Amino acid sequence: SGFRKMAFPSGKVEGCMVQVTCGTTTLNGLWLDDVVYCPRHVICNPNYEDLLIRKSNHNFLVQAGNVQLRVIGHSMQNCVLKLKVDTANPKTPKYKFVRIQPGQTFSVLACYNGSPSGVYQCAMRPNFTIKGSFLNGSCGSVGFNIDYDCVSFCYMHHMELPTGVHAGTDLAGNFYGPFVDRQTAQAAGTDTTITVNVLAWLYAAVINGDRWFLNRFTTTLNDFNLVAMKYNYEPLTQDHVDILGPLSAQTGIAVLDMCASLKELLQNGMNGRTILGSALLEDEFTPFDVVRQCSGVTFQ
Amino acid sequence: SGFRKMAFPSGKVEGCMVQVTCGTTTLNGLWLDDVVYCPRHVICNPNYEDLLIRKSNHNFLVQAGNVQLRVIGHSMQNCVLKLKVDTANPKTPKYKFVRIQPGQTFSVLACYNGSPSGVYQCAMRPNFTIKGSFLNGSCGSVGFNIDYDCVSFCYMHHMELPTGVHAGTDLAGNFYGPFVDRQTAQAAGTDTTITVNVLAWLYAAVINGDRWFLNRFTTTLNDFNLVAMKYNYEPLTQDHVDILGPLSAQTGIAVLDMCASLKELLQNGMNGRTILGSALLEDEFTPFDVVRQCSGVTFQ
Ligand SMILES: *[C@H](O)[C@H](C[C@@H]1CCNC1=O)NC(=O)[C@H](CC(C)(C)C)NC(=O)[C@@H](NC(=O)NC(C)(C)C)C(C)(C)C
Ligand SMILES: *[C@H](O)[C@H](C[C@@H]1CCNC1=O)NC(=O)[C@H](CC(C)(C)C)NC(=O)[C@@H](NC(=O)NC(C)(C)C)C(C)(C)C
């Protein structure tokens, strides 16, 4: 038992990290087969189309550790640059590029000068920022999930907002949210709490022995979403309810009954008490996360 | 900027995880050079001496993926079993075995059937338990730090205490704490909050732009330790003060001044406020963890 903010083992992704240097800029790239993916502002209101037409392959220095990777071609796809190199990465895992929905979680492998510094778990916030941990040089670090043997890359890091939160793209270079990779006024936008994730984490607490916050009540989905509005929370759909089905069957707690508990927690607070070691209602665990950690899924 | 509970990249350790099956017990081992390290209870008031002498090499089934390693010798060291295999692990990293002090943190690679399930950060609590996330089959998962190129293994997992927390050994088989690998009554014993770590985390908050908890007051090391006792905090030593020196110099906040801030947080609570996204005072970041993550150290 126990419950931790658990990242996926980072091994398959560490094997893909490289360093991309162009001009006075150095950042990270993701090397899959014979392509290196990296944020396009490595060539830096910019006009990346002109900026890139004026590049040559030899302007791009790519180290894979202590082995210079030679660029033989390049193209831009949205906000990422794809550098064709003359060597296929022999450590390339089985992989998939996926664009995730807000509320979904992923692991981030934070990197500098092409070498991993740390791994941690994040969520795509409803306002399409992530509350990451990134310093100068971290751009190009990626976010990912693992499904059995396959790495699903869902994020690459581009920039930090004035509020200290982070914005980036899918691996096809499309920003999550309204953000752009130019230095102009941009702000996150009002965030909300991910309701279905809070519910899942309350099921995790029950699976792990915490029951103090349960009650005999129930609510309707409509009356529950009515209190969720006030507390800044996302609407819970019948689809969310179906998704919480397995967790509700494992625990014997009807999904609407757990909603009644979350209502009482928003209305009354925790009164100096904790849940799974937190004094706040946690929303960066998805229903699938809870089942994975509480049932012991592995990856190969 | 930002601050997350960050684990070390797990790749180097993933390359060392194997499955060890003996009789009807299955768990993980750590394969380094031609030695597989695993908890000795895989051969189960037992008497592991008699129990081991009645074993043969062919009783131990060591799965390294879809490759069965062959045991050619076994030896017990304290509570760990060392299986000599006829194949050196080609993925063996540069490594050390270290036995850490309480208050030190480390990354845990949770595994089942030789296959890593997830990575998370832990502290050795002052009562020599860890608050981990472990299910049946997780024994033999390891904890570790990485220093430039070197993996320092500091923990191997053995058992769960009735309170939901975890006990294990160093890699030389010595338990942390008074615990033993015997099904007999054992309990964590009273824990305390790691004071030097809370202070480091407050410095982390300051580096990241939180200052709301600061004050103009100061305190003597004596008078600070006096309130810490009342709140079940560890005594802060002059050595702890020295250790917090670099964080104090970078932030301009004298160590005893940040102590006066912790005192007021202890006496007044946060009154609905948060620090680094937490409504509790966090003590699982060491002063080195803070400097590492706030200055961007990497590993190769
Ligand atoms: C790439 O390594 C770097 C990563 C950030 C550096 C500090 N923390 C980070 O996450 N990104 C980067 O340099 C950005 C480059 C562009 C995408 C803007 C071209 N620059 C920034 O993130 C900057 N923020 C910023 O200017 N924000 C607004 C005004 C909203 C565009 C800085 C964090 C100030 C460098
Ligand atoms: C090995 O995979 C396993 C890991 C635990 C299983 C669930 N969570 C865990 O961390 N350990 C294990 O099977 C232990 C075997 C001995 C070390 C006791 C020989 N058994 C336990 O951890 C058990 N706990 C227990 O009996 N604790 C006291 C009473 C303090 C000895 C169980 C968790 C009940 C299996």
Per-position DSSP letters for A86-117, written without gaps between them: SS--TTPPSEEE-PPPTT-EEEEEEEETTEEE
Phi, psi angles (nearest 5°) of residue B186 = -150, 140
- Non-local CB neighbours of A273 within 8 Å, separated by 6+ positions: A212, A279
Q: Is the CB of B183 under 6 A from ligand 2?
A: yes
Mapped onto helix, strand or coil, the DSSP state of residue B54 is coil
Q: What residues line ligand 1, using a CB cutoff of 6 Å?
A: A 27, 41, 44, 134-139, 158-161, 166, 181, 183, 186
CB atoms within 10 A of CB B13: 28
Chain A residues within 8 A of B10 when measuring between CB atoms: 9-11, 119
User: B108 by DSSP, 3-state: which?
Assistant: strand
Which three-class secondary structure state does DSSP give residue A228?
A: helix
Cα A14–Cα A19–Cα A22 angle in degrees, nearest 5: 160
Is there a contact between A7 and B135 if contact means CB atoms under 8 Å apart? no
Residues in chain A: 300
Q: What are phi and psi of A201, to 5 degrees?
A: -70, -30
Which amino acid appears at position B145 of this protein?
N
Residue B151 near residue B95 (C-beta atoms within 8 A): yes
Task: Report CA B154 to chain centroid distance, whole Å.
Answer: 7
Gyration radius from chain A CA atoms: 21
A84 phi, psi to nearest 5 deg: -75, 125
B166, HSE (Cβ side, Cα atoms, 13 Å): 28
Resolution (angstroms) equals 1.7
CA-to-CA distance for A140 and A156, rounded, in angstroms? Answer: 6
Is residue B290 lining ligand 2, measured as CB closer than 6 Å?
Answer: no
Angle at A203 between CA A199 and CA A204, to 5 degrees: 115
Q: The domain spanning residue A208 has which CATH number?
A: 1.10.1840.10
Q: How many helices (H) and strands (E) does chain A have?
A: 8, 13
Helix (H, G, I), strand (E, B) or coil at A36: strand
Looking at the complex, does the CB of residue A237 fall below 8 Å from at least one CB of chain B? Answer: no
Atom number in ligand 2 closest to CA B185? 29
What is the distance between the alpha carbons of residues A9 and A298, in angstroms, rounded to a whole number?
A: 10
Measured at the alpha carbon of residue B105, what is the angle toward residues B298 and B63, in degrees to the nearest 5?
80
Closest ligand to the CA of B44: 2
Report helix, strand or coil for B28: strand
Q: How far apart are CA A128 and CA A110, in angstroms?
A: 19
Domain boundaries, position A18 = 12-85
Six-digit token pair at A48? 């990346």
Helices B221-230 and B255-268: crossing angle in degrees, nearest 10, is: 30
CA atoms of B155 and B168, how far apart (whole Å): 7
Q: Both tokens of residue A21? A: 């240097």
Compute CA distances B252 → A14, A115, B196, B209, whole Å.
Answer: 36, 31, 18, 13
Contact A9 B117 (CB under 8 A): yes
Instruction: Tell me if residue B190 falls in helix, strand or coil.
Output: coil
Chain B neighbors of A208, CB-CB under 8 A = 164
Q: Give B19's DSSP letter.
A: E
Amino acid (one-letter) located at A57? N
CB distance A259 to A253 below 8 Å = no
Chain B partners within 8 Å of A7 (Cβ):
7, 118-120
- Which has the closest alpha carbon to A177: A163, A164, A190? A190
Q: What is the DSSP string of B23-61?
A: TTEEEEEEEETTEEEEEGGGG----HHHHHHT--GGGEE
Cα–Cα distance, A150 to A142 (Å, whole number): 15
**Tokens representing A135?**
């310093």
Q: Identify the H or E element spanning B83.
A: strand B80-85
How far is it, in rounded angstroms, from Cα A123 to Cα A195?
13
Q: Which residues of A are catalytic?
A: 41, 139
Residue B31 is part of a domain; what is its CATH number? 2.40.10.10
Please check whether residue A177 is in contact with residue A189, taking contact to mean a CB–CB distance below 8 angstroms.
yes
The residue type at B50? D
Helix, strand, or coil here: A81?
strand
Pairwise CA distance, residues B137 & B114, whole Å = 9
Query: Checking DSSP bridges between strand B150-160 and strand B95-97, what pairing results, if any?
Result: parallel
| B113, B115, B120: residue with CB nearest A5 | B120
B120, A7 Cβ separation under 8 angstroms:
yes
CB B121 within 8 A of CB B6: yes
Which residues pair with residue A76 across a beta bridge?
Answer: A81
For residue B66, give Cα distances in angstroms to A298, B99, B114. Answer: 15, 32, 11
Residue A227 touches partner B, C-beta closer than 8 Å: no
Determine which residue's CA is closest to atom 27 belonging to ligand 1.
Answer: A161
Contact criterion met (CB below 8 Å) for B51 and B94: no
B158 lines ligand 2 (CB under 6 A): yes
B34, B101, B19: which is closest to B66 by C-alpha? B19
Cβ(B80)–Cβ(B172) below 8 Å: yes
Distance CA B281, CA B273 (A): 11
